[PDB]
Amino acid sequence: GXXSDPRXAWRX
């Protein structure tokens, strides 16, 4: 869901 950030893409 929080895939809208380079450090959150691998967190979505």
PDB file of N, CA and C in Angstrom:
ATOM      1  N   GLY A   1       0.810  -1.205   0.000  1.00  0.00           N
ATOM      2  CA  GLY A   1       0.000   0.000   0.000  1.00  0.00           C
ATOM      3  C   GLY A   1       0.845   1.257   0.000  1.00  0.00           C
ATOM      4  N   UNK A   2       1.949   1.216   0.728  1.00  0.00           N
ATOM      5  CA  UNK A   2       2.867   2.338   0.797  1.00  0.00           C
ATOM      6  C   UNK A   2       3.975   2.092  -0.201  1.00  0.00           C
ATOM      7  N   UNK A   3       3.591   1.819  -1.422  1.00  0.00           N
ATOM      8  CA  UNK A   3       4.560   1.485  -2.449  1.00  0.00           C
ATOM      9  C   UNK A   3       4.956   2.708  -3.276  1.00  0.00           C
ATOM     10  N   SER A   4       4.522   3.868  -2.828  1.00  0.00           N
ATOM     11  CA  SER A   4       4.790   5.125  -3.530  1.00  0.00           C
ATOM     12  C   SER A   4       6.098   5.802  -3.086  1.00  0.00           C
ATOM     13  N   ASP A   5       7.069   5.017  -2.636  1.00  0.00           N
ATOM     14  CA  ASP A   5       8.365   5.557  -2.212  1.00  0.00           C
ATOM     15  C   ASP A   5       9.445   4.504  -2.403  1.00  0.00           C
ATOM     16  N   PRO A   6      10.648   4.891  -2.860  1.00  0.00           N
ATOM     17  CA  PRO A   6      11.754   3.950  -3.078  1.00  0.00           C
ATOM     18  C   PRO A   6      12.075   3.098  -1.844  1.00  0.00           C
ATOM     19  N   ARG A   7      11.828   3.643  -0.657  1.00  0.00           N
ATOM     20  CA  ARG A   7      12.092   2.927   0.592  1.00  0.00           C
ATOM     21  C   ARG A   7      10.827   2.374   1.199  1.00  0.00           C
ATOM     22  N   UNK A   8       9.814   2.323   0.400  1.00  0.00           N
ATOM     23  CA  UNK A   8       8.532   1.829   0.830  1.00  0.00           C
ATOM     24  C   UNK A   8       8.006   0.865  -0.222  1.00  0.00           C
ATOM     25  N   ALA A   9       8.630   0.908  -1.400  1.00  0.00           N
ATOM     26  CA  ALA A   9       8.281   0.011  -2.483  1.00  0.00           C
ATOM     27  C   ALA A   9       8.578  -1.395  -2.025  1.00  0.00           C
ATOM     28  N   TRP A  10       9.746  -1.557  -1.422  1.00  0.00           N
ATOM     29  CA  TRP A  10      10.122  -2.838  -0.867  1.00  0.00           C
ATOM     30  C   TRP A  10       9.621  -2.949   0.566  1.00  0.00           C
ATOM     31  N   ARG A  11       8.449  -2.375   0.786  1.00  0.00           N
ATOM     32  CA  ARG A  11       7.797  -2.390   2.081  1.00  0.00           C
ATOM     33  C   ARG A  11       6.288  -2.587   1.883  1.00  0.00           C
ATOM     34  N   UNK A  12       5.845  -2.485   0.627  1.00  0.00           N
ATOM     35  CA  UNK A  12       4.439  -2.636   0.279  1.00  0.00           C
ATOM     36  C   UNK A  12       4.098  -4.104   0.037  1.00  0.00           C
TER      37      UNK A  12
END
